[PDB]
Symmetry: C2
Subunit: 299 residues, 2 copies
């Protein structure tokens, strides 16, 4: 058995995300764990819990490379994949890997991808192992990788961000509730730079949220921790997005992590939207990049 790649995290790195994972736990359960190698020499490897949200949404519970302690790709650059991924809910078992992985009592978490010496050009298995606080307890999980998929966190690299608005906790819940009220319907999201307003409509139903302008462009907004939670926004263009009410509801929920993050809506020139979890200055330097992509939903 040969090792294709080795990935190991720093002491207790992933444990600080324990509560964050718990918040997203229910949505991440039926998804998959995925390590993005496609960005190894672009910051480092990126492990992420990836799953669906609603009728047209993709969650990416991603860990910043800052959490990585050692990376090793033993395959020729040309053989290694852009990404490997196994399913979060391990084969047969009752244990959800993401839960154990992002556990708070884990000192060292690490992954090892293997293949059989003979036939097979790409990794075929992964071996997660978590070593706990007690300096005594270990857990090793051997799983089969899945049919290759691109890095979830790769679908927006060529997209153009025309603005993003921070949603104050109450506003977020308010929207999140409205979205839920719309069931399996669609929501037409409207960004109006002129009116400093974001609008959502689903049939006759409707909802309007105002926002204070930031005398700065999209890409220069919310670059660091969110020091204040207020309905603020940096928009530089109009746009209408057709998303699924249910996906929007799940996103707003997941990105508002108690005492940790507040939802930030990122608008793209194409009809696409990405609800991002803006980290509060309080919740320290969590190596988290949580987002949910709202795909185009034909109503």
């Amino acid at each position: 058995m040969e090792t294709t790649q080795t990935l190991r995290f720093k002491t207790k790195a992933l444990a600080v995300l324990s509560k964050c994972y718990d918040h997203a736990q229910t949505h991440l359960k039926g998804g998959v764990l995925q390590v993005n190698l496609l960005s190894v020499n672009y910051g480092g490897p990126r492990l992420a819990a990836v799953a669906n949200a609603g009728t047209a949404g993709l969650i990416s519970f991603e860990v910043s490379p800052d959490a990585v302690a050692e990376w090793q790709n033993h395959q020729s650059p040309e053989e290694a994949p852009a990404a490997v991924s196994f399913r979060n809910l391990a084969y047969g078992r009752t244990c959800v890997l993401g839960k154990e992985l992002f556990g708070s009592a884990v000192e060292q978490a690490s992954l090892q991808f293997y293949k059989r010496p003979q036939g097979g050009s790409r990794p075929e298995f992964v071996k997660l192992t978590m070593e706990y606080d007690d300096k005594v307890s270990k857990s090793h999980h051997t799983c089969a990788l899945m049919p290759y998929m691109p890095p979830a966190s790769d679908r927006l690299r060529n997209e153009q961000m025309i603005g993003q608005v921070l949603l104050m906790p109450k506003t977020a819940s308010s929207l999140q509730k409205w979205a839920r009220q719309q069931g399996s319907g669609g929501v037409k999201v409207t960004l109006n730079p002129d009116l400093y307003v974001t609008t959502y409509t689903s049939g006759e139903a409707c909802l309007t949220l105002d926002y204070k302008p930031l005398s700065v462009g999209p890409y220069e907004a919310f670059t660091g921790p969110v020091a204040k939670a207020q309905d603020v926004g940096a928009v530089e263009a109009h746009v209408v997005c057709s998303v699924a009410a249910d996906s929007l509801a799940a996103a707003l929920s997941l990105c508002r992590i108690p005492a940790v993050s507040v939802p930030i809506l990122r608008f793209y020139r194409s009809g696409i939207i990405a609800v991002v979890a803006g980290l509060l200055t309080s919740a320290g330097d969590l190596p988290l990049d949580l987002s949910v992509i709202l795909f185009n939903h034909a109503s």
Copy 2:
């Protein structure tokens, strides 16, 4: 690291218990997993999930020795302990070991015990391993054992059984509901050979259950599967037992596993009751000895 004991179960042996465990998982979760070494010259090692039920009850989900494929004790009889135990809910972990151990897809299950070559009469750690159907997935859990405890399935060795009555579904359920209604009070259970009836009182509340006599003593009854389910009993002496209503309710619930078992109440001369899960001929030959001991409880 020195290996003291090794236990390997037969292929798929513990998987047949999958639904049975699930039926008790809520109770077993906070208990412990434990291997009774005493029963090695009495059929073989006995693994059991052991936990508390109500205010005065001990639950024992024991696996018949005929499920074990290979046992090896590498310690002299002097050093070897009577029983080894470790938390069912693994340390800092999120999965309960028992849930994964009795997984329906576990091809092979095995346990190993170790200790350091210094200070330590008995084993200090255990390593459970699960090999799955897919012939690819494996799980290894390494834990610390707990301060030693006697084999749960031993507390009834000197006790002399004076009677046992089987309860059919509708009957058991009446008793269980009655017990839950008595909330946190105590139940005075009476066995009357002259009136062929068992009575339950908790304050002004009461309940009487008739049973048809078996022309055989206590120890020769319900030896094998129970092809039918009718309120019959092989009693042979009066006895009044003081039990906790909540333990009684839990015990009846646990021993009536849907389409698998029916509760059987075993009364002992000492006024102690043990609720047992009589297996229906319907269920196959499950290697399961589930029971719940109702200890003495005062008003």
